[PDB]
Amino acid sequence: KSASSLLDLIWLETILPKTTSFIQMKMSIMVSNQKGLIKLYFLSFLITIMISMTLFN
Amino acid sequence: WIARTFYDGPEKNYEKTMAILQIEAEKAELRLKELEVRRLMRARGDGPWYQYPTIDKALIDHSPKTTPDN
Amino acid sequence: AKTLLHKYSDIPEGTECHRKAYASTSIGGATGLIVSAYSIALKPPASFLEGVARTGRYTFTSAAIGAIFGLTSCISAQVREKPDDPLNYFIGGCAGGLTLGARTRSYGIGAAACAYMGLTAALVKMGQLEGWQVFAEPKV
Amino acid sequence: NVLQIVRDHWVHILVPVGFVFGCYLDRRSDEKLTAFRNKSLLFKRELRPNEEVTWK
Amino acid sequence: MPLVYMNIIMAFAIALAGLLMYRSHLMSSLLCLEGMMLSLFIMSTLIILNTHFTLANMMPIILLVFAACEAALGLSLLVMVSNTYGTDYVQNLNLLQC
Amino acid sequence: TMMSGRPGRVPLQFLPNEARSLPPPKLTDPRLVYMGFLGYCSGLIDNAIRRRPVVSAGLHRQLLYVTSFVFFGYYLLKRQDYMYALRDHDMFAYVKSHPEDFPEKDKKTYGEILEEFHPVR
Amino acid sequence: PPEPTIRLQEDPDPEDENLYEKNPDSHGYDKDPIVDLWNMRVVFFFGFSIVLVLGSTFVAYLPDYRMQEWARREAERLVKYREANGLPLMESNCFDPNKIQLPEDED
Amino acid sequence: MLKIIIPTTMLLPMTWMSKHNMIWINATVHSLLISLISLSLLNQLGENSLNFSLTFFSDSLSAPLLVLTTWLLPLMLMASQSHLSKETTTRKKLYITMLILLQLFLIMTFTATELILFYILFEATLVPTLIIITRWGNQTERLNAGLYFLFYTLAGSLPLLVALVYIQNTTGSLNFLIIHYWSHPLSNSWSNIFMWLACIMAFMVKMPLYGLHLWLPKAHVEAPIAGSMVLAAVLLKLGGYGMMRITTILNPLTNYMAYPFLMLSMWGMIMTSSICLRQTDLKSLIAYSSVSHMALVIVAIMIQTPWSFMGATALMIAHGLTSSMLFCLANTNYERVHSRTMILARGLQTLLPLMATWWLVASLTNLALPPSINLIGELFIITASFSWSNITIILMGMNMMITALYSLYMLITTQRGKYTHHINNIKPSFTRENALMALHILPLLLLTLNPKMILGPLY
Amino acid sequence: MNPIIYTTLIMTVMSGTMLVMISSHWLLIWIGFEMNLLAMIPVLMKNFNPRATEAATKYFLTQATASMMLMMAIIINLLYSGQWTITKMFNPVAMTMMTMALAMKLGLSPFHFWVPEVTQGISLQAGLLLLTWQKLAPLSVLCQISQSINPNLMLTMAMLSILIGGWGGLNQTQLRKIMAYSSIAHMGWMTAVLPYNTTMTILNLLIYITMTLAMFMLLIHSSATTTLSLSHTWNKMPVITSLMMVTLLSMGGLPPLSGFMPKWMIIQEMTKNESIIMPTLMAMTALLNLYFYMRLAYSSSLTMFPSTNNMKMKWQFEHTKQMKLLPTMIVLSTLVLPMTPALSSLN
Amino acid sequence: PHGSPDWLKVGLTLGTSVFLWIYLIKQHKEDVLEYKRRNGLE
Amino acid sequence: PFFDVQKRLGLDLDRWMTIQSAEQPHKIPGRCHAFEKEWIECAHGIGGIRAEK
């Protein structure tokens, strides 16, 4: 109950591997989900240029 | 018989290890010295390394320039 | 820029709780505004009013997260009488994570935030103490 | 039958040849580490009448 | 640095921001590129004429020519895109997605 | 070490004349043997890809591969040795010309140095 | 539902093949009896005969490079010397304090 | 040292050029000859080491591991020759090539006079094992197992590399001899704490530690017989060898930092021993037994005393041999049954008596029955831990009790009782399997006659 | 197109890159960039379809904007110092604009968006050329002015590129998008060592170019552009799949393969300058790239996917066109780790 | 398809390999001689 | 990176335009000819770091 299922099969699995897998999947989905509209990418580029000009000097 | 036909004398390993230790010590000191030399040359720039190019002064035209004050 | 960094760092750790909380709230608000701008640029949800509501929510959450962290870290440092201890920063960061989870209303998110930004705050405190450089200049 | 079993059993000579070549290469690497031969304080020795090196 | 150079850089930045806005009309993207080119030509000409860099007078015209060639290329591309859709709307180019 | 601006450097010279004062690598150098082995592996892969008997399809092609690999490896080894010699020469010259930044440490014996002892318990 | 209920054209799962049915004295090495027998013979000769016996004898009679008997004889002669001279066997200091230069405190 | 490496490299050309029906015979014969050649490395000195050259050196810690690695290959070939019968010649040669490459990488890793070369070979051993697990595996989960067995390792090993190069920037040399002779104490600082962690967790992940042991049951279950043998016998010992080699520079910070890992190992040995009691899979049970033994080895290494190191070396050698034998016996059962479940096939002592004797001997030597070297290592580690603290004896005794319990449980469930009625394909055990068991077990009972051969450099 | 026209355009691209590389005047560098961009478009639109045209127009827009900001940076640098030579950039406002322009030309984050789109739109040969040859000129310009870059901005962009490539490559089933994200991650690794050592940058460029050439040529040989299409390759040329898996392991940074050589050295170099956190983050992020490489290898050679009946006919034919440099590229991208010190040749 | 060994290509390959080997040996001999001359060994 | 073909061959493809004080047509001087000339001879061969400092 505790040694085999609760810790070995569930919580030790939940902490290191499963959390990493979930976080990486979420970040990959968020980053890659771009509809292909150059308007959004260009606005993001403008925001990044403004941030670089106002932050790195 | 085994020691005679398979293994060399004790001194062999002793002096081989001495030579190996000497070589590795020289390598370590040379590594530290090279790192320090790199740092000094990059910081000061007087050394042969990290010599970034400047304008060549042979390109300058030394002739009257239609105006006395250059 | 680094004006907020100077304002936050100049204040001593063991004094001026309100000033530290104000600086942390300002930093959090700026970060939340930046995140809101990025989200709006990449994903325009439905309209101007929905977008401004989203920006306000994100900014309040981040400013809110920052406010909780600053007040807790400074109070722990003062009452424990042992400044320059990463444990106080760990406690403050994890309290901020608990508040973030309460805002998001998720026990798992709250616990994960507590752990993952308490560790981050402790690491930042250790780097400040030991002088670790994230962006090292060219030494050699 | 010679020149017939060789075409099938010639692979059996590879490993012993590798072993003797490895012994030769071990001596190869040994010959380059004689900078302190007969020079350690523990085994400073006078050479025998018909001896040139202490160890090879 | 006088105010004229600052205003020219401001015009260039405004043209770049308009290019990055992308309301519609990829033709407007080309127009923003050409406005950026015009600002660059004006600034380069003013700087070169101010300092009496005699040889650098070659610099502006060359730039102009090259940019115009670029413009031509872009125009051609736009036509082909329109030749598929019938309009030069930006949102029609959504087949490729990250 | 950025030797791009080292004074008296010919721009597009693979091997400068002064490199001729260094001992050339032997024809039995292990690095040359590894380059020949890489050429042999490339020949085997070429035979495998084109659906040919891997070991005995083209002897001329494999031998050309090995020979070209050995040639390029020899010249690359020459250049590498020259560059390392240059680096050591520059480092030694800089150390010699700047004695104040490389002082001679006072030699101390372990009998006069107090090192803290940490028991293992 | 006109589907054939077959997802794909696949070979049936083959049954296990017995090495004993087609060839008794099978030795479990190969389906070819001669190659099987020779594989068994070389395995037994190079595992049990060559390595297990000759290697064990070689390890058993390895020369004393660890210096066990040498250390025992050195200790024997050293104790014989110290007992005769009245010295107090092994000293507490591993090094002579005369050649150790302590740092004076003056505190 | 090249007298061992070059024949191992020549093993490849020989296999490829070998006749389509003579690969196994040639490979086994020449691997046994190479093991006989590598037997010469056991002749060590009470002095520093056997420094062959600038690149490779030998030690009485490296020598038994090298001998075991050279000895394992013929056994792996004999075990793998069975289930690869219906397999094409090219792919069988590829399997033998993977085994030879793994042996060559391990042999070069165990000498490794320099730490960066040690890291390079220690991480190069990963690729052949991953290929073997993910290619010649039966279940559909093998791929997942491979992923685990990969990433866990890298998750621990990538920081180590950074630490390693950092040390070379500060110390100036990563050679083991210079590192030992020029070792300096570590100040109790946050930076030194993190350098300690970076140097330690890379080897702790592969032992594995109790917290980081998840990959091991998957990798051992889904791998083929040769993969299980090489994972249990040699690949687990790389972490211990690395820890014993690298703990020299970590002092005196080891005293403070050893506490979390000591507690984790001392409790995880009990946890895994108890897990073994309730297990429906033979391979999983053997894997958890391996985890328990390696946790004891971790405790020994962290205690950092001469008796600790001696017991650790003896225990690694003994555990490697014992786990390889247990996996071989389980695979022999599986090849007849095709279910890999303990409760399915029962009463095998009635049908296969000699295999039952082999099972009994394997269980006894896993049970740490004196005067086996398993017991020698266990007792040395127990005594060193008692010297470290008198309260550890409770946990150690509990671990011994549960170990005996689950070992005899494994023996009784599969060998004793009444046979399964509907199973009728249980053929008599072949000469190959019996020879494999004998070649696994005889070295243990011969090494118990000369324990000092496997007690390490601190003997 | 006419083969003579294609040869002329390829030579024009190469001549533009060489003009960028060998000229000491900023105007000539800009002219070389313009020539390269002008000659690149028809190569991208060799196969006529709406996808190719869309990819080409996206590429044209991005490169024109990058060239225009490059020209503005040159103008500002001239304004604050009457210098046309490519040297220290003098002005800091013109050095930040010179960095973003070269970043968009290279495809570094946050200007990475166009790379997957253009790579997916164009064919395999155009993708090979775009991802291999189009990196020489901007990297050369960056190496020349490396001492002028602010380490903060360049390192931020490199770390962002690595993170974005690693995350975005996980969600891809198309091979061209995978290659584009791999290129983004490798460029991020490349530019993270520019402030410290340009030799490491060039070494990483060479290794990445060799690995990408081998990978793209293997993809061309087994004419598959998706994961499932590549999954059918084992049934005809299994050796191609095995070589592909070895190459993919090489690009994952796994030792003792060739791809481990750059990263290692870069980390080593960055440990000389008292930088520790960033290399660790880079390695932990490159674990993601290795993950999706391993997934592709799983689907490619380590498992046998179901096939189709018609494949039997493909068994009766051989490739008429063969690539001569593929075996050499594979060997160089797999087995050159023992040759590491040769990097002292200032490659 | 149905083709004989192209003796032109075989001859070119053998000639290229032999020429490269001869050039390499000559270059090595010249390098040893030059190094001995500059360093004053023999 | 920089392949100095011009310095290897002595071609002078674009060095004539790099600076203001390099042979303008009809000897027309730059507005800052003297200052550029002084700064260039100050920094010739010295190297970028030392020239800057």
Ligand SMILES: CCCCCCCCCCCCCCCCCC(=O)OC[C@H](COP(=O)([O-])OCC(O)COP(=O)([O-])OC[C@@H](COC(=O)CCCCCCCCCCCCCCCCC)OC(=O)CCCCCCCCCCCCCCCCC)OC(=O)CCCCCCCCCCCCCCCCC
């Ligand atoms: C530490 C370094 C030391 C070790 C070095 C290791 C590397 C060295 C070699 C590097 C590569 C060069 C050679 C490989 C060419 C590939 C050709 C091949 O496939 O083999 C078939 C061929 C025989 O087959 P065949 O009758 O020609 O027709 C069958 C077709 O070829 C094809 O038949 P098929 O298509 O019907 O069969 C399909 C099969 C066929 O597919 C393949 O086999 C592909 C080949 C493997 C890919 C190679 C990648 C490049 C090398 C990477 C090495 C990585 C090293 C790092 C460690 C990590 C390991 C990945 O593919 C599959 O089954 C798919 C699944 C395979 C499993 C997953 C993939 C794992 C493969 C990784 C292997 C890596 C090591 C390769 C070792 C050499 C293998 C030949 O094998 C050979 O005969 C050539 C082997 C070498 C020749 C030895 C001759 C020398 C002996 C005389 C000279 C004595 C020397 C000493 C001098 C002094 C004495 C007096």
Ligand SMILES: CCCCCCCCCCCCCCCCC[C@@H](O)O[C@H](CO[C@H](O)CCCCCCCCCCCCCCC)COP(=O)(O)OCC[N+](C)(C)C
């Ligand atoms: C079937 C029933 C039995 C029938 C047979 C009856 C006969 C019984 C006899 C068998 C056991 C009874 C005990 C008798 C033991 C006497 C022999 C013993 O004394 O020799 C030992 C010798 O044994 C060896 O030392 C141990 C064996 C070597 C271990 C290597 C294993 C073989 C290599 C295979 C690969 C390794 C794989 C594992 C990797 C490590 C110890 O010798 P030692 O007192 O010290 O000194 C030797 C003499 N000196 C002084 C001159 C030096």
Ligand SMILES: CCCCCCCCCCCCCCCCC[C@@H](O)O[C@H](CO[C@H](O)CCCCCCCCCCCCCCC)COP(=O)(O)OCC[N+](C)(C)C
């Ligand atoms: C998950 C399965 C197992 C995986 C491996 C787990 C083992 C790794 C754990 C590492 C050991 C602990 C790390 C640091 C230990 C230092 C000792 C410390 O605990 O004691 C006090 C330290 O005080 C507090 O602990 C401050 C640190 C608090 C922040 C740490 C977070 C606490 C819980 C987080 C656990 C998560 C770890 C795993 C992250 C992925 C002493 O106070 P002080 O004398 O002043 O400091 C002495 C050290 N100096 C000299 C360098 C300054």
Ligand SMILES: CCCCCCCCCCCCCCCCC[C@@H](O)O[C@H](CO[C@H](O)CCCCCCCCCCCCCCC)COP(=O)(O)OCC[N+](C)(C)C
């Ligand atoms: C992936 C492995 C590498 C493969 C590389 C391709 C191999 C085929 C190339 C064929 C020969 C190319 C050499 C060119 C001939 C003459 C070159 C000479 O004129 O240039 C010199 C320089 O020579 C070349 O740079 C050396 C190229 C040699 C590349 C080999 C290094 C590979 C890295 C280590 C991996 C081991 C690979 C071994 C197998 C190939 C002068 O350079 P310089 O004008 O003053 O400054 C520019 C360079 N800076 C800016 C960095 C300072």
Ligand SMILES: CCCCCCCC/C=C\CCCCCCCC(=O)O[C@H](COC(=O)CCCCCCC/C=C/CCCCCCCC)COP(=O)(O)OCCN
């Ligand atoms: C199976 C998964 C296990 C994962 C293992 C991870 C544990 C290792 C520790 C984290 C990585 C640290 C790598 C550092 C490499 C050693 C270099 C070093 O120690 O030098 C320090 C650098 O120390 C650091 O910078 C370390 C900062 C850590 C940054 C990365 C954080 C990663 C996660 C930390 C939380 C986890 C802590 C415990 C993890 C245990 C694993 C479960 C000195 O820096 P300087 O600037 O040169 O000093 C000058 C002034 N004296």
